[PDB]
Subunit: 101 residues, 3 copies
């Protein structure tokens, strides 16, 4: 059944860590907020997360879904980070472009 399973697929079982910050700030402003920066950046952040999503999801596929086994998992987390930080490049570049425009 698609219930919570293909919806899990829809979420990639969890969105990329960018959308974690996105959703936290999203709730914080859904309270109320006049922030010019966080008026409508929700659309952009996921749109940027697109190209990253393939790599991050596949790199989490073979990686453990718990990630609470050990802090030593940071190395495998860092093995993923070898290009996840190359994506963080794009993330911060998107931050620069958002600030500029």
């Amino acid at each position: 059944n698609h219930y919570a399973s293909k919806k899990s697929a829809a979420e990639s079982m969890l969105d990329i860590a960018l959308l974690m910050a996105n959703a936290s700030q999203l709730k914080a402003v859904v309270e109320q907020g006049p922030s010019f920066a966080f008026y409508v950046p929700l659309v952009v952040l996921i749109s940027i997360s697109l190209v990253l999503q393939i790599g991050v999801g596949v790199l989490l596929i073979f990686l453990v879904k718990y990630d609470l086994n050990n802090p030593a998992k940071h190395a495998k987390l860092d093995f993923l980070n070898n290009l996840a930080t190359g994506l963080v490049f794009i993330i911060v570049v998107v931050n620069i472009f958002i600030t500029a425009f």
Copy 2:
């Protein structure tokens, strides 16, 4: 008999996870709602779900119908997600287009 069997086919035994969110928000507004966003987006969401439906349904065919066997099913769920997230691309692009228009 078509009863709950070809109707199951009509629903694909469950609609794509997009329509899960669609129907939840649908009930929430059927209570009552003036939301400009959720006045009549029901038509669009299924229409978008069309092209995705073939892939998602066939990818759920050989996949288990329970999906409550293990959280480890996320990997096979993620094996489906390899292109299900490519469809999530289209989903969020549709969100962008809906917001723009």
Copy 3:
């Protein structure tokens, strides 16, 4: 004798699952109803069901007429659904066209 046998043929022993919803809503409004959507959509729904009927009936011919043998029948039901959902495409497209006109 044609009695309940060629009448069974006339009904295809049961109409396609579209007409199940059609007849349920039909009774619900035969009670009474001012619904602009469900004033006279009975004609269209069967007319749309035409092209689907050949495939669905033949796909139910070799399939069991009980369909209460197992929930596992969903897979064979889903084997039928491989193109039954391709027909659900047409079904929802017809819904879109009905809403537009």
